[PDB]
Design a protein around this ligand. Structure first.
Ligand code: FMN
Ligand code: FMN
Lengths: 135, 128
């Protein structure tokens, strides 16, 4: 009597840390960001707008994990990855990050919802060792 | 697979800021813009109640209002209006987006253009 919603389910596991991108626009730019995301990353909203989320990555980020995210996106499947991200001030944190494509009635991915979440060193070690099972 | 097997659309949605007085629109998908016939700027900063008109069931509007204050997720079938005056039945869903403390700071709203007979079914059921 009440629908399942990939978008709603995602945004509710997101504890006010999320973004929305527009896939129809060049390079999948951010078009909304929650206050939780602003305070987690350290960026202000205007700077965040119209930019691809890759700005959260830095020198130490695992390119292999970025590979998984790029690949998941091109293929239209939802996944989650744990990688090192960077705040506006240069401080780092491990990010268990989930992404889901939103499609129109004709099956075309039109928007993306990203969900970020800081995790402990311990949880991250666990998460990364699982992700590395692929290799 | 009765109320969700064919309510499958997710391109029509809006996000409102509940921390601002009249729970105004802060974002709206292009699918929404196309459905309702509005441009994004006009939509922004306004409450969504502009979709309602003379023939919209007040009792259904109530079931929404109450679900929002109480912060519970609900689906409501409504008669809505496009900017050009034309109507459509909206199987509409609201959910509160809470932070790590359980506070609602945002709301997602997903709208679904539905058929005549499906809406009659949804409406007959709502009357209980
Ligand atoms: C909605 C959405 C949210 C994203 N959030 C993050 C994120 O929080 N951290 C991150 O490192 N990458 C994130 N990404 C991935 C980057 O935006 C980008 O797709 C990725 O770095 C691979 O693309 P590239 O090789 O062009 O950099 C997100 C992508 C999308 C679509
Ligand atoms: C995120 C969100 C989306 C909404 N979308 C619609 C909609 O598409 N159609 C509609 O009739 N009401 C919609 N509403 C309901 C109105 O915005 C408002 O909550 C409702 O009219 C009850 O409040 P009121 O008694 O002041 O009118 C939405 C509300 C929220 C919070």
């Amino acid at each position: 009597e009440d629908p399942d919603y990939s978008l709603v389910k995602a945004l509710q596991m997101a504890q006010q840390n999320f973004v929305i991108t527009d896939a129809s626009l060049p390079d999948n730019p951010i078009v909304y960001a929650s206050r939780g995301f602003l305070t987690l990353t350290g960026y202000s909203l205007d700077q965040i707008l119209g930019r691809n989320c890759r700005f959260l990555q830095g020198p130490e980020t695992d390119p292999r994990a970025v590979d998984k995210i790029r690949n998941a996106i091109t293929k239209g499947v939802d996944t989650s990855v744990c990688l090192l991200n960077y705040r506006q001030d240069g401080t780092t944190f491990w990010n268990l990050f989930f992404v889901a494509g939103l499609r129109d009635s004709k099956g075309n991915i039109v928007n993306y919802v990203g969900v970020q979440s800081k995790v402990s060193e311990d949880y991250a070690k666990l998460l990364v060792n699982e992700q590395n099972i692929e290799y």
